[PDB]
Amino acid sequence: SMSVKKPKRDDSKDLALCSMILTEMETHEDAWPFLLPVNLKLVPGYKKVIKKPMDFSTIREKLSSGQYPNLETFALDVRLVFDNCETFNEDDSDIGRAGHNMRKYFEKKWTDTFK
């Protein structure tokens, strides 16, 4: 509350650490469905169904340009990528499986780096 603060958690390395995590996601062999925005002209249904499209290149641009106010807003966009994937893709599909794998990979890196 006013003039009553919890001790200051050091957040000065968060930008660099989110960038490293993002690099590792970008270079994972199952990242291919997620590298670029889904082409809204060429994928029937996507525009109407997926209210907030998100992909690694769009996260990279937002990260690079100061559009994440903190590390939690960064994690929300990464998880949005996988939540979108689950909404549109069957679990038993290459893309569906890719999304499960990447979410697992992300969450471990996130915990090991920050928790």
Swiss-Prot record:
Subunit structure: Component of the BRF-1 ISWI chromatin remodeling complex, at least composed of SMARCA1 and BAZ2B, which regulates the spacing of histone octamers on the DNA template to facilitate access to DNA. Within the BRF-1 ISWI chromatin remodeling complex interacts with SMARCA1; the interaction is direct. Component of the BRF-5 ISWI chromatin remodeling complex, at least composed of SMARCA5/SNF2H and BAZ2B, which regulates the spacing of histone octamers on the DNA template to facilitate access to DNA.
Residue stretches making up the Bromo domain: 9-113
Tissue distribution: Expressed at varying levels in several tissues, whereas a smaller transcript was expressed specifically in testis.
Localisation per UniProt entry: Nucleus
Function: Regulatory subunit of the ATP-dependent BRF-1 and BRF-5 ISWI chromatin remodeling complexes, which form ordered nucleosome arrays on chromatin and facilitate access to DNA during DNA-templated processes such as DNA replication, transcription, and repair. Both complexes regulate the spacing of nucleosomes along the chromatin and have the ability to slide mononucleosomes to the center of a DNA template. The BRF-1 ISWI chromatin remodeling complex has a lower ATP hydrolysis rate than the BRF-5 ISWI chromatin remodeling complex.
Family that this chain belongs to: Belongs to the WAL family.
Gene that specifies this protein: BAZ2B
Protein name from the UniProt record: Bromodomain adjacent to zinc finger domain protein 2B
Covered range of the whole protein: 2054 to 2166 of 2168
